Design a protein around this ligand. Sequence first.
Ligand code: NA
Length: 330
Amino acid sequence: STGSATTTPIDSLDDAYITPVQIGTPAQTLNLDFDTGSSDLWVFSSETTASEVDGQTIYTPSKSTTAKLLSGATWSISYGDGSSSSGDVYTDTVSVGGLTVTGQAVESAKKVSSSFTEDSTIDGLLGLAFSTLNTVSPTQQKTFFDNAKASLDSPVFTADLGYHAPGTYNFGFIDTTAYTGSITYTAVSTKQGFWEWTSTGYAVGSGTFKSTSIDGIADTGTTLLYLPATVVSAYWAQVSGAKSSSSVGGYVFPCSATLPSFTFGVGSARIVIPGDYIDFGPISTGSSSCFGGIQSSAGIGINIFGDVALKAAFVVFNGATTPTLGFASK
Ligand code: NA
């Protein structure tokens, strides 16, 4: 089997991407944030505290003829940005882009933090990191990908995120029409539960390539590119008037600037992030200070290849017995 779904930016900045997911019988379609950095499929629901729901579509298990309470199971998750959610668990039929899993754990939120309530466009998360990170207790649950894997034509999914445009998530096949040149595959460590790999270095604009190992994670659920402070300082030094602002919470630059590109290595291959991808617009409405898309990972304890980097590539998440990542230009 295969599946193929379109993923759509939630706003003009590509702050996140939503993908429609069918849950239950008859189908209830919710718009979920596919997150390769976490392993829970959770939704706004009929159980979510009413004051914490503001415009999201909800899952109502009582209206699904295939929903069953997973008796005694609870979940609770905290993300890198400080947001959180928790609740109880149903099993139900879940379909993505024509690919169906029966008996998927659907984690129903009883509580969500303020950042989730305030985002009316995201109805929940669909985790695509390794199932070792799933938070369900006392019986840990499998991701949608791990439950689908054995049925797929190939044990893979691909992320093809757009810049200010829709893109695609495919399950079970490589679309050889969706990229240019060849795919370069690189080793993955699953020791922290992430799609963790080692970049071979970087360049700023038309500058020389610096060969250096950068360990980090491929995370579709993180908006920005978070790298070591040395690499980030080297990038923003090439932008007149850029500075790190403790008051704003990262590097800002004059909105009048033209940003240089950023290149990262994948083995002997190179992925080029155009400068435009690194502009996240005014810090507040009408400001002439703009927020950068490359930020320091110092204090986060890991480097994160988030959407700014991933949407410059066609990305293969190879879930074979020894997992690997693949990157191609597009
Ligand atoms: Na922000």
